[PDB]
Amino acid sequence: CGELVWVGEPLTLRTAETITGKYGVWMRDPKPTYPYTQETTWRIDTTDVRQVFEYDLISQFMQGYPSKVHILPRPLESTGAVVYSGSLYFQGAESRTVIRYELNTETVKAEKEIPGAGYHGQFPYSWGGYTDIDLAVDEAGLWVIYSTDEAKGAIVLSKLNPENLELEQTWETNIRKQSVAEAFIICGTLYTVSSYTSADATVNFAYDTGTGISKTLTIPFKNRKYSSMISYNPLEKKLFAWDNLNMVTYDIKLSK
């Protein structure tokens, strides 16, 4: 682990064929858990988002033929969901509740109202929408990024116990959530993306959970169609940026 020092140029990943009509944001598990593997893919059905497609083999994923279709027990608020350690973690629609849905048993194993978190457009990033609550995974596990009335719109982040969703540790930054386009976590440091609509953007803030200090940064971050979501995969050590149909990757290097 270490501080982020380099971000590569965006590299396009080959998009799966859209013939079967399933082209929502997809994700993999950075802690693959039997019966799944590092190659298992999940795709959120992009309405009242209620379906998640599961593809055991990349061959099936690229053909658009899921190995399993999960009907979620509640609707999703956002695409800021993550798969980690065998569970889908997502925000219930029109709520501040995070839900742990164990994928192979199709069982809700935990629910947690994030205390005081704004939802449904109260604390978005810089470009509106319902991005108030943002789940993230890094080398240490599961996190949630949000804000509260108490924090006055500043980014708040909490480390989540992946079994029962307890908030094991919480930090209040001094970074206004609305002042940045999105945030992600690498090795316990929160980073923010300055903008998705400026071609020559930056990673422009870093908040270190080991020190409680936020700093400005100017690491070049190139936007080459606008990305609508970004997610760090700590198993692959890359950022995955989604544009509503295609996925691009950004290689990263740390001060390891």
Numbering used by the authors: 245 to 290, 293 to 470, 472 to 503
What does the paper say about this structure?
While the folds are nearly indistinguishable [Fig. 1(a)], one difference is the presence or absence of a heptacoordinate calcium ion bound in the central internal solvent-filled cavity of the β-propeller [Fig. 1(b)]. To survey the OLF triads for calcium binding and to test whether calcium binding can be reverted by simultaneously altering Asn428 to an acidic Asp or Glu, we replaced the triad Asp–Asn–Asp with Asp–Glu–Ser, Asp–Asp–His and Asp–Glu–Lys via site-directed mutagenesis of Asn428 and Asp478.
Asp–Glu–Ser is the second-ranked triad in Arthropoda. In the case of myoc-OLFN428E/D478S the conversion of Asn428 to Glu decreases the stability compared with the previously characterized myoc-OLFD478S, reverting to the value for myoc-OLFWT. Among the well ordered loops is one encompassing residues 259–268, which is shifted ∼5 Å in myoc-OLFN428D/D478H and myoc-OLFN428E/D478S compared with the analogous residues forming the top helical turn in myoc-OLFWT [top and middle in Figs. 3(a) and 3(c)]. Given the strong (for myoc-OLFN428E/D478S) and marginal (myoc-OLFN428D/D478H) stabilization by Ca2+ seen by DSF, we considered assigning either of these difference peaks as a Ca2+, but were ultimately unable to confirm calcium in either variant. To support the absence of Ca2+ in the structure, we employed a strategy used recently to identify Ca2+ ions by anomalous scattering. Our data only reveal anomalous difference peaks from sulfur [Cys245–Cys435 disulfide (not shown) and selected methionines; Supplementary Fig S4(a)].
